[PDB]
Amino acid sequence: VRRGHVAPQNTFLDTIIRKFEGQSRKFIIANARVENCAVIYCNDGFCELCGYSRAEVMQRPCTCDFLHGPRTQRRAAAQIAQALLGAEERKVEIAFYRKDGSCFLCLVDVVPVKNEDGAVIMFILNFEVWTILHYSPFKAVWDWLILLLVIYTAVFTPYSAAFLCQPLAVVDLIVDIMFIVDILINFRTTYVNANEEVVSHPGRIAVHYFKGWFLIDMVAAIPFDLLIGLLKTARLLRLVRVARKLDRYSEYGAAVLFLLMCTFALIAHWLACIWYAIGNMEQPIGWLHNLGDQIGKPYGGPSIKDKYVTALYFTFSSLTSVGFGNVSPNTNSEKIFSICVMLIGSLMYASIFGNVSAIIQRLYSGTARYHTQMLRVREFIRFHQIPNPLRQRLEEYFQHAWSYTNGIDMNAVLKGFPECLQADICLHLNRSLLQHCKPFRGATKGCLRALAMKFKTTHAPPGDTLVHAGDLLTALYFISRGSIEILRGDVVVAILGKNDIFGEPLNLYARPGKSNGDVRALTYCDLHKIHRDDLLEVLDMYPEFSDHFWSSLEITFNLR
Amino acid sequence: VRRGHVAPQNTFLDTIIRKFEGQSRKFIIANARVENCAVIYCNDGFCELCGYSRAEVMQRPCTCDFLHGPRTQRRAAAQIAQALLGAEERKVEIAFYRKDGSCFLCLVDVVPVKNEDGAVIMFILNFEVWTILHYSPFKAVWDWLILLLVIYTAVFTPYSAAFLCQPLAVVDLIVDIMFIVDILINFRTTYVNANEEVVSHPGRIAVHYFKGWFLIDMVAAIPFDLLIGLLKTARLLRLVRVARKLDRYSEYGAAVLFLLMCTFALIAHWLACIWYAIGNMEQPIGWLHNLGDQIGKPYGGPSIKDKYVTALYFTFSSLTSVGFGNVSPNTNSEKIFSICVMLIGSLMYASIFGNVSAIIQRLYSGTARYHTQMLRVREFIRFHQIPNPLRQRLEEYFQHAWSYTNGIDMNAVLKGFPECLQADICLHLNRSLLQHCKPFRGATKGCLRALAMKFKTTHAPPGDTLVHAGDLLTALYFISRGSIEILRGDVVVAILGKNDIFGEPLNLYARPGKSNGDVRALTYCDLHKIHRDDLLEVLDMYPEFSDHFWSSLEITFNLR
Amino acid sequence: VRRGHVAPQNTFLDTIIRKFEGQSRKFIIANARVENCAVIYCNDGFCELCGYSRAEVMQRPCTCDFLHGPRTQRRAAAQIAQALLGAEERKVEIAFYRKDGSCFLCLVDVVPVKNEDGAVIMFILNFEVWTILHYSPFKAVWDWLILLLVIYTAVFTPYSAAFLCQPLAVVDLIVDIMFIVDILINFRTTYVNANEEVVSHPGRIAVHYFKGWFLIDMVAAIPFDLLIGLLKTARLLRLVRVARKLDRYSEYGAAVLFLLMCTFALIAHWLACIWYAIGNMEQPIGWLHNLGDQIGKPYGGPSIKDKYVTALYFTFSSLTSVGFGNVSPNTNSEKIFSICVMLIGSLMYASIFGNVSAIIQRLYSGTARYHTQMLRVREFIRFHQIPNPLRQRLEEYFQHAWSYTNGIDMNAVLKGFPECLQADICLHLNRSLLQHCKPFRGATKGCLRALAMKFKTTHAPPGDTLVHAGDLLTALYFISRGSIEILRGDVVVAILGKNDIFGEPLNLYARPGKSNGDVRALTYCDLHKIHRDDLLEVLDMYPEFSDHFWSSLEITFNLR
């Protein structure tokens, strides 16, 4: 289920501007925490008065020296300066000057705003001539509890209606209380408006709940004493609660299959009850008389245990397209019902199990594409005829890479997000380097995001050659986990464990230098990677970082 | 089935470091085969003692001249040098010096490690102040043998249970032995752990087999003498062996269809037996009495041959959605069973044959996309209205290219793999050139991989013009198979067979030179290709290779 | 159906080299039509003899001046020169010299090859010390005629076998003749070998037809006189002719649906006959007795008209999953058959109509994607809320572009083909320009292909602004059909009809010049397009073409 982000702590500024926008007033806003109180807003009405644009007015003292002129008094201007420090309402009068030259008399209404703590935050200068959340685990698990007792009302209210201290009557009365309790919960609980990402408190929620889904849910919780048994069919409107809250029940993949399969039972259930109703209410030959000849109970009559089973047995067989012929429609009303069940059944059986077949492939989606992606590799091997030592690499790498990634395109997901969140994702992915290592600490946050974007992650399983002898070292690597070894003609030279760096320094050569020897991983080593073209372009942007970077950084193996 | 790569020969170094990591000791490792015994590892504890970082300590003699100072003796340092050559344990004492200046007394524990042959490989200097494989063809074919006799137990154990030197009893006792033998095989056979790519020997396998799939498979192989016929239903747990080993049975495309179709029979089989059980255990009107009136055997009674057939005949018709009405449920228990079979059948018939329909399209996947890809070309021809001489080329090339590649994207597969394995694939693909030809022999392995990446393969069928007269010769070609001819106005000049080269030398012109004449293939000629921009960029990286390349290489046809 | 390209006219050279390759001889080949008889082939055996490589030997006179030395006679060398002009076999002896220095005596066997006309084409110098085609419209339409009379044999041979001047017997004997005629046709007709793209004449075809599909088709055409009616069931093997020739019948989209639907009838047909056979051959209660009670013919017996209908009626209902219950299996054999029909029917009905549902969507594939592509545009309009004057453009352009292209990606098709055939396609697409226009005539074929690749086609419907006033004229246009008008503030200036050019000359400015005014089409104008960056890069390659191009070309509207 969706939950919007909470309103930022500076959103009060928007409501002040939006209220004064309705008044058509002319004003400016200036901050208190800043040194000389720089102006941070100027509406269109203010620019028409003075003549100056936003660019000129913004980032200037709130006393406004440029507005003063010959006609202004020294004593009158001093009253405005003292009013900022004193923190109170003083309507001081003074005659400002425009950009072009003309003067005007104006009333300066200084009204400081304050928070709950008791401190002056902003300066508005007007001119004139018992709570619950919607995303809580309490409500989340209780929605499943509603859905369970909703199924109860879908099953037992038609069976009670059609076929007619008691154990059944007492449990039914407990369900009536839960829906009355549900209405009380829906007032105090929060919701997500389109514009307002979150909303709380009872003054605002009751307006939304009225003129919405309360009218239908109001009828659900109205029991009465006053046969008249048909009034209990209003409890089927409790099923509407599931439709409006469908976003919560569609989260899990397996839970969706339960809904589609249990509804199929309820569809037949109702039709079974409706099929039974057709037999009783026309009784002058039909299907119920016909059943009395099959099972030995002609007319007393057959039992209700049988009467419902045989009726459900029928309507399942009719809408599953079996058609057994133990029971079958003879009268015109029965046949018309069978026509209705065959028509709705052909729509249902096509639509509902078309989804279930898709949901099984959607649940087992990893293993579905895995076999098709595997058959590409097997056809690729048989095409070129690849020998055994390379055969083992392509099979084991593919299964290792797929089991690691779960058959997911990692770069394809990041392209949907913008550069701000892409940087934040990559900042999290490379948290092991940027936090712990020596050179990356002494740097601004813009540099960290800039680097993180160009960084990569490359999982090297046991016995995988990353680089070979005499190769162009494009990359500069960083190791987080595992233990990588460097060799040179079957001679073990290096053993690079955690928090190690290997490659070449970019300052000395200024060219793509050749390698020293091969480098192979022992364990499932987690490591990171960049390029010379990628890295150098970052250091050109940040010159103060570059001198700090290369000095503090220490490569464990210089490769030449 | 997946099989991990064997642990590399230098993995003992990781276990030594990981054991000493638990001790919290401070040490270094140095190689013996190398000249002056360079240090190849240094933990965090060692850097805290001396003060020096990894970059300074690595690639230096293991005697450590930088650690010595004024306080160290000449006789004491000589004991460490002799200990390296002698190969034994000597705890020599000497007072080293730190980087900053301060001294410390320390005990040098030199412990050389040795292999099975009997030679000193490494120097650890501590400081203190009857087998079987899982991927074998024996086990592979025997898993199919298990699956066959598992189907036996799925079919014959319900039929024996429900409907009741003998030929049947003796064959059943042989199957009981095979599962007891299976348990003995599962101990000695290998498996694939998540971390440990391969694992062997009985000390490690028994720990994994216990607390896993042995508990279920233990119950399978427990026969007893002690009617009590229901205890034989535990043999259905032998079916669990197929689920846990499902990765092996899903390899072949046609073999998957056999599983999905034979299970459909077994599903009905069990339900047939369950349908029969419902008739017998309620016998005070039902379906079995009803059958005695159809076939002339009222009550003796009808035969077991019939009794099972009619029961299977029912349950197939019920779950295939036919519903014949020879046999049909009359009692409440029978109807509830029919409701159960209709509900499970609607799920089964939708799910299982949804997969079979996909598996037929997945097996015939080449011919499926071939017709759709063909209809693009036929619509492309009808759109532009292409004449006969060009019509023949597009049809014959498409069918030749598709029959060659089997409708597979060759470049799309390589993009999934990294640059290391991509080079290894391309090294195999261009093995005909790099091994046999004259100039490519005298070169380093980095050059061979660098070239191979930029190379291509272009199959030219009979009568295909590769290059025309007056064209810009971007490429430089190499022929492996077939026989290509060069013409110039219907005059046969060249006949280039195997191991031939044509194009232009890149040293003389330093520009894109024009061609001499046309060039056409006779047979299905296999040849390779590069570009000027691609090739020149490789030779710039390797200057010693470039002078060797152009001198030794000899182009058969210079084209101007 | 696939048909390979005919063997090129110079393929005799390959067979001569391949035959002499078996002999392990050492030789060269030289052309006659060329001036000084340049050598055009040299095997590995020749290079071992002399010492010289291919590069040095190729493109030199066949007399070989470099091979001569001091020991060679003036009179002996003259015999070789006269032998080239005379055209006959002379085994002249002369002692050649190697590259290194050593001499050797050798026999020069000059054997000129000749064609059917009677002219010397090549010079091989050995050294020693009633027809029919497969793709014809005769065979194409006759394969459909076979398939029609194959269906006859599938339908009438079981009906004749199972249920038992005559009109029926005479027509059956005509079909027996057609299959005997088919065998005679299959000898003389051609086929497509994997290596040999085409093959003809009776010496080669009979070897392929034997040990192939003749053995099965031989049994089809063996009638005998000698009840023994079961021998006529061998005529079902005539159905195998359709399977082996399936490539021809899968061409048309609608014709595939006919095969899948007519087979479904034949599947039921056979099963109907098999269902009938079960009734007769067990006759001591069954289904045939049961039918005698429904329709008033107990036992004479019921008619064969009925007996077959009711049997087909059954087997359709069984495998269509209806199950009527007029007729139904009572005996064990009948039920086992119903189990078999339900099992094969569930496989058939899933597989065969899964294809038919796909074939309907594949036949109506244009209209399928059209609606989905339309819904993108309708959602795109509702997203941005586009006004009426632009609304009309996006709707009309999309329908015009889709109706023109039939929903096909034009550039996506060309990427599959190589640069040779891509150029040939684009040469055909821009045939209107390159043939008819003035500047493109005086140019080499390499230039025409180079230009054609970079050219485009842009259909401008009525009232479409191609270029606006003050725009950067990147392109230079060519008009083939229609009539385009140029305006400048609602003033009609130009009327450019067929074979016209507009843009700017690239020689004068050497910069992207601005436009003069707007340009709009009247009719469905067909026109072509290029760019400055695209065009200039071609003219840099061909300097002799560039001076010819700009002088002869004349732009109708210079735009400034």
From Swiss-Prot, chains A, B, C:
Consequence of substituting residue 342 to I: In LQT2; uncertain significance
Cytoplasmic-side segments: 188-211, 249-254
Consequence of substituting residue 446 to V: In LQT2; uncertain significance
Outcome after substituting residue 485 to K: In LQT2; uncertain significance
Domain PAS intervals: 39-68
Outcome recorded upon mutating residue 515 to P: In LQT2; uncertain significance
Reported impact of residue 112 to S: In LQT2; uncertain significance
Result of changing residue 299 to C: In LQT2; uncertain significance
Effect of residue 354 to R: In LQT2; uncertain significance
Start-end of intramembrane regions: 309-329
Result, substituting residue 189 to N: In LQT2; uncertain significance
Mutation effect (residue 217 to H): In LQT2; uncertain significance
Impact reported for residue 84 to P: In LQT2; uncertain significance
Record annotation: effect of changing residue 332 to K: In LQT2; uncertain significance
Effect of mutating residue 265 to E: In LQT2; uncertain significance
Consequence of changing residue 191 to C: In LQT2; uncertain significance
Protein's UniProt name: Voltage-gated inwardly rectifying potassium channel KCNH2
Source organism: Homo sapiens (Human)
Gene (UniProt): KCNH2
